[PDB]
Amino acid sequence: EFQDWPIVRIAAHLPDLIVYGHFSPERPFMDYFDGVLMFVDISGFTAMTEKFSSAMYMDRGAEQLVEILNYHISAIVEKVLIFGGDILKFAGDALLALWRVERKQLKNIITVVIKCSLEIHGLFETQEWEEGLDIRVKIGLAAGHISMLVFGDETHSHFLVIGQAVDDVRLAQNMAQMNDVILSPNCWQLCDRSMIEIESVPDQRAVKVNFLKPPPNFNFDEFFTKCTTFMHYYPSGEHKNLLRLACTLKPDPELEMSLQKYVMESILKQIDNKQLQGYLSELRPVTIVFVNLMFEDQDKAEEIGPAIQDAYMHITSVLKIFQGQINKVFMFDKGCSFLCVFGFGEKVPDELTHALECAMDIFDFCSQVHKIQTVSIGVASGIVFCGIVGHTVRHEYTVIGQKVNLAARMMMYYPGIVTCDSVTYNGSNLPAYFFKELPKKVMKGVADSGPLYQYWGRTEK
Ligand SMILES: Oc1c(Cl)cc(Cl)cc1Sc1cc(Cl)cc(Cl)c1O
The missing domain is CATH 3.30.70.1230 (Nucleotide cyclase, GGDEF domain)
Structure with missing residues (x-):
């Protein structure tokens, strides 16, 4: 039995919960x-x-x-x-x-x-x-x-x-x-x-x-x-x-059309043998923009559903402009979190200025969304490990690194604002007064994060 069809390679990235679901088109x-x-x-x-x-x-x-x-x-x-x-x-x-x-x-x-x-x-x-x-x-x-x-x-x-x-x-x-x-x-x-x-x-x-x-x-x-x-x-x-x-799925254009949407374009390229199978395993400098959305009640999908959907529509738009990508979405202890990455995407100049500006826009739009109580964004830049992690039959692209955890921790330990690390601060090529230097907090997983900053933005407000 032949099993190495593109549809089957795609399904390696997904659980059965998705692979064998039948969802309406509504979002x-x-x-x-x-x-x-x-x-x-x-x-x-x-x-x-x-x-x-x-x-x-x-x-x-x-x-x-x-x-x-x-x-x-x-x-x-x-x-x-x-x-x-x-x-x-x-x-x-x-x-x-x-x-x-x-x-x-x-x-x-x-x-x-x-x-x-x-x-x-x-x-x-x-x-x-x-x-x-x-x-x-x-x-x-x-x-x-x-x-x-x-x-x-x-x-x-x-x-x-x-x-x-x-x-x-x-x-x-x-x-x-x-x-x-x-x-x-x-x-x-x-x-x-x-x-x-x-x-x-x-x-x-x-x-x-x-x-x-x-x-x-x-x-x-x-x-x-x-x-x-x-x-x-x-x-x-x-x-x-x-x-x-x-592993026994057979070609089916409609199902494949559905599933491919869950998977990043650069993985699909690889699935299609149009990119080297090793290209995604890398240590690359990136900027992480980690966006957290807190809700009054995070167990009721009927409540938080529409808001996540609304926020996603904006986040995806702002990122296409500024050249970033959503890599993963998470439910932490507190909130829905979007792990966004700039640079590994095109390695573009003003990556940092763009990551910051993109954060503030996300922040302003999301704070006006109905059920969202608070928005928190952490921005850190550095070398992170990228690669496909798991088994042959079940695996997913992931990012791993101290900078990933730093952004995750900033958005939790500094709720309600946009925060950025020193790398981002000094390489932004923005004036210093668009920032405020923050209290140093002790954070789980982090050792000498370095000085942290709030992105205050252009005006006094
Ligand atoms: O994103 C999550 C969902 Cl949908 C369900 C659960 Cl219980 C936890 C999380 S957070 C989470 C999940 C994984 Cl697989 C790995 C890490 Cl490091 C997480 O923080």
Whole structure:
């Protein structure tokens, strides 16, 4: 069976949630279901980005990083898939997976996901980045009501998952230390508490898993085969040798037209063998504009949907002008966040002046959008790693770096304004009075960010 059709290559970049959906044309588009989520984080990892940016890597830093990374991540991906999960999203050291089930099946599916989780922890026992650096994971699990939001325009589409269970999975992840599997309160509440030994987490309703202790006669394999009965797209029969049913997709112009919109133009070029398969693995100077939109209530897709859609329409317009691109959209703890990048796009002059001006315009327009309570934008510039991360059958373009995290942290620790780093400040070729120098705040993940600035803009206001 031939399987290397462009449609199949495109679907590698997408979860089944999109690949096998049937969305109306309307934007936004909302859908509601139940399932279990797994949010996975790899340790020892800001440490790698540093290792690999050093001159010791002789200009093959991006290459070696992408390699060592995919080696470990693609092992995580195979597990998730074999355990019947759908990998929703990657970014950096982290990936999100979903086992979408009917509400009666949640209890049993939780047991699968827990087992999957302990097997992931077992991959990395006795396992190091380098001599003297352990690689470990932290896993958060959640279960419940989940909303999909799809937004975009006629040529580009994005999705997010929303709701308290998504919020719960992020909270369980943040609590988790290395080697932990943390359950949300609702996940603990819905699980088969006869099989699952836990301990409490101080100042938290969430729980940590110690052991999976099934009864004397329980057979995990037969229990899992019974759970696959409820999985629409688990590969089987003649296709039981395959990690994803998506690998059997056949040409279909309409579906391809739909899917390609989720994928960046430079990936499509590569998919089409019109660009070298290695061209995207790089260390490149870019400017990151990280835009955060806070809402009164970030679990109600009917509320935040239209606003995200409205904001997207503007952001995409302002970026086409100023020569940037949306790379990924995120739901953090607080808000919807757009990860925008200038430079790797064309490497253009006035990149910095343009990134700033583009931020202020986004900021002004978005602050006037109905349900948006607050807008926050962080702007940082520097060398970041770019590349396609994951498995052959499931992978996504991502950006990784101290500057990516710096912009992400600025927009959280300096809400309501546009902030920029020193690189951006000094290389802007704008007058100093378009800025204010800010209080130095201590920020999670960041060591000597350097002086930070508010982009005040042209007038006194
Ligand atoms: O901050 C994130 C990183 Cl580093 C990786 C991934 Cl896969 C996701 C997030 S935030 C986020 C979390 C959930 Cl639970 C769902 C969505 Cl739609 C997100 O963007």
